[PDB]
Amino acid sequence: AIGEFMVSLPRMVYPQPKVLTPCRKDVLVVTPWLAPIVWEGTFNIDILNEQFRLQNTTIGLTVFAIKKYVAFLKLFLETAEKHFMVGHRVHYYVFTDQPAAVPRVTLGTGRQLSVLEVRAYKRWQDVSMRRMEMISDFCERRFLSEVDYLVCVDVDMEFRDHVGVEILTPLFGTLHPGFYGSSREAFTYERRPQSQAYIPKDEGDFYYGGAFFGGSVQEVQRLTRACHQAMMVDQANGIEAVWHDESHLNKYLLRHKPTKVLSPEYLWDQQLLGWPAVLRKLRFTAVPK
Amino acid sequence: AIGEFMVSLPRMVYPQPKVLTPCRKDVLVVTPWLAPIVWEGTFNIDILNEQFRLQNTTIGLTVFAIKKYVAFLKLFLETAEKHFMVGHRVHYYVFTDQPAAVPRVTLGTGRQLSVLEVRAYKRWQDVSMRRMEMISDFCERRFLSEVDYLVCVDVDMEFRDHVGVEILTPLFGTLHPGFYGSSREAFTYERRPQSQAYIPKDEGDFYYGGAFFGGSVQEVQRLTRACHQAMMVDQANGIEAVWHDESHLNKYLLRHKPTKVLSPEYLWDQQLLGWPAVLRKLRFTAVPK
């Protein structure tokens, strides 16, 4: 459940927070609209686990495995079993054009998987973009009745460390690993005013990655519907945004500020970018080709 | 309104947040349960004003002026007019045993004041403690229909700088100015196990001040009802907590973590404590005697 009467926390013994010591001296840990930016060292997972377990939280995880991408499912799901929301109720939703190609992965107690058959588009760009329509449609069909939060991710990835309830909030985006240190002028936002995803050179907070976003079912429905409708307007106007669904996600999150932002710990590519000092953990990473 | 469909923010030009620069290097700006700790330098007030104005936010401010404390109302209200939630809808609620002693203070547009007549208790301790019962009772009578958030403060104070929508959240407490740098063992929590306010030496996050707390009407109702019921149990058991309502507030906020914590900028005494380097602004301060 979300936003329902909360019982008291039990007695807990943990180190006292230190008012006169910053939790990080090397990174920004709160946005200018007072949303936490989630880095290792900012949170006590024991306190957060208590808070979310007492609310009997269920987390949905959506993933698309269309055409050749079914090959990524086995590693994705097996590593999710090790690292994603362990101890909490989880419902995996696998969107695929090939239900028979979904691997039989052994799941821990309180965790389930549903296969949702969808159509395959020819262009990889359309497969990617149409995730917004499909997620929005299923928010109405299944998600509202089955989960409290939705986490929407790319499939060609693996979990390598803890991804837990610290991410949960009404609306979150994730700092794209290629651009977290970049100035806004260098962000690869859509720059053509003819597109619904247009962002001028003097606007923008962060460059969010299309590969990892989420929130409450209500807020994810709103985001995905808005991005789908914007893409349809663009299509009618004969324009396709430079980075497809990610361009629209960035426009939406500029105009509707997320209530948490995840650090690049949560979306990384070690082959391309190595392992910088600012990342104490690499949690969710690209599978190398 | 709270938690209702939110329109898009307009185009805004402001400095880009800096991912690789901490907003403060001298203080903790987020709790271990990912609640912002509100200090100057953590927030862009222009973004926050937009977010809250678009929701047509109304803020209630409660203050008790019983017996001789009516003398503090003129300065309290005149300085609130200069500094508290300017630009937003405000409803002042003055609880008093002397309706005729309430000064005629000139209010800005969209701001109103109601006088609520209540009984006076003989002991200053009971006057202070019974605020919990009275606030809870009025949450049901007026507050649910009239305001979105409630801010509950001591009257023998004055505003000296901005106190705005940066504080608003479902539940907040404020770091007591006497103890923000203290270890938990030194906190003046209630230490007798016979009291409902009991906190052991190895528990506690912060020492919150009884003089400044608030949140959504729903969360304030819960807090004030819980503290009142706990005080009644103590009374039946022949025990009175060491710091009265503040002791119970601290027990409640230990077991129900606030969603924002205000720095001592928001609750200060310059005569007693001066003006430390960590305070860039002194916002709400004790009136000297």
Ligand SMILES: CCCCCCCCO[C@@H]1O[C@H](CO)[C@H](O)[C@H](O)[C@H]1O[C@@H]1O[C@@H](C)[C@@H](O)[C@@H](O)[C@@H]1O
């Ligand atoms: C600061 C110097 C500029 C250097 C920036 C290097 C990162 C580029 O990143 C790409 O960024 C694009 C947006 O501009 C899209 O998000 C694309 O999906 C992404 O590539 C994806 O994510 C990457 C991390 C890799 O895993 C790549 O194989 C993926 O296709």
Ligand SMILES: CCCCCCCCO[C@@H]1O[C@H](CO)[C@H](O)[C@H](O)[C@H]1O[C@@H]1O[C@@H](C)[C@@H](O)[C@@H](O)[C@@H]1O
């Ligand atoms: C670290 C060295 C220890 C030194 C600590 C000095 C601050 C003491 O503070 C008192 O703390 C009490 C709880 O323990 C109550 O909250 C009391 O209301 C408060 O006095 C109030 O607030 C004060 C700031 C003053 O304005 C005082 O006049 C008020 O009555």
Ligand SMILES: [Mn+2]
């Ligand atoms: Mn990919």
Ligand SMILES: [Mn+2]
């Ligand atoms: Mn006082």
